[PDB]
Design a protein around this ligand. Structure first.
Ligand SMILES: CCNc1cc2cc(-c3cncn3C)nc(N)c2cn1
Length: 250
């Protein structure tokens, strides 16, 4: 039963907050959750149980405690998050974006196959592993408004289709750099999500026909018709994808 004393804070890596750890010449990523929100605003033992169960999702090494704080000692991936990588490139090329989205989709499919909806999919929580494939973090069982599905907005009873909407938001944001339903106020954002106000580009920048369709099937208002993994795997944009091989590449 190791103790948090052995861990030496190096420098923060995320805004709970995520710090870069040190222990025995090893680097961990330690999330700190003070009892200010853990024991005074409600589902903490929900992110720790979705992270303990593994090959597509960030590895959780230890579950540690404190005077007020809780500590998630997870693996450290120098590759950073897709959020940062995207700011650097401005946006990804069609081939590169499909590469990441397919990896995210396999991770989503893994999660659901094990009775787990993410509910908080966004590039910020998509980590570029040391191997190169995407890993998932910040398990939220209201989150970032820009990625929430209409049913999440309307407080409806929902299913894994929320994750495919979020996936659609990221697929658009990988081709543009900007999320599709982006606006100045949070209320404005909800109107765009509900209106399905996707601002497709025009000219030399205008999105591919296979890219526009792939976003459309993911960003479908009616959750009983919206795209799943089956629809996605068979969609023409993911044609040059070997899911059998990708599953092994891990
Ligand atoms: C250099 C940056 N790389 C990095 C970032 C990490 C962030 C989180 C996390 C936990 N909750 C949200 N995030 C985003 N978890 C980890 N295991 C992380 C490992 N490495």
């Amino acid at each position: 039963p190791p103790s948090i004393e052995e861990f030496s804070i190096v420098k923060p890596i995320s805004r709970g907050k995520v710090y870069l750890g040190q222990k025995g010449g090893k680097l961990y990523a330690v999330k700190v959750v003070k009892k200010a929100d853990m024991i005074n605003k409600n589902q903490v033992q929900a992110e720790r149980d979705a992270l303990a169960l593994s090959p597509f999702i960030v590895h959780l090494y230890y579950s540690l405690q404190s005077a007020n704080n809780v500590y998630l000692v997870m693996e450290y991936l120098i590759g950073g998050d897709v959020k940062s990588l995207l700011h650097i490139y401005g946006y990804f090329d069609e081939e590169m974006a499909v590469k990441y989205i397919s990896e995210v989709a396999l991770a989503l499919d893994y999660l659901h196959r094990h009775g787990i909806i993410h509910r908080d999919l966004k590039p910020d929580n998509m980590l570029i592993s040391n191997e190169g494939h995407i890993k998932l973090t910040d398990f939220g069982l209201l989150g970032t408004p820009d990625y929430l599905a209409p049913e999440l907005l309307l407080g409806r009873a929902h299913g894994p289709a929320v994750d495919w909407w979020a996936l659609g938001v990221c697929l658009f944001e990988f081709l543009t750099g900007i999320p599709p339903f982006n606006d100045e106020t949070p209320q404005q954002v909800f109107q765009n999500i509900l209106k399905r106000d996707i601002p497709w580009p025009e000219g030399e920048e205008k999105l591919s026909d296979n890219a526009q369709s792939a976003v459309e099937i993911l960003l479908t208002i009616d959750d009983t018709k919206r795209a799943g993994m089956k629809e996605l795997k068979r969609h023409p944009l993911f044609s040059d994808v070997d899911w059998e091989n990708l599953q092994h590449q891990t």
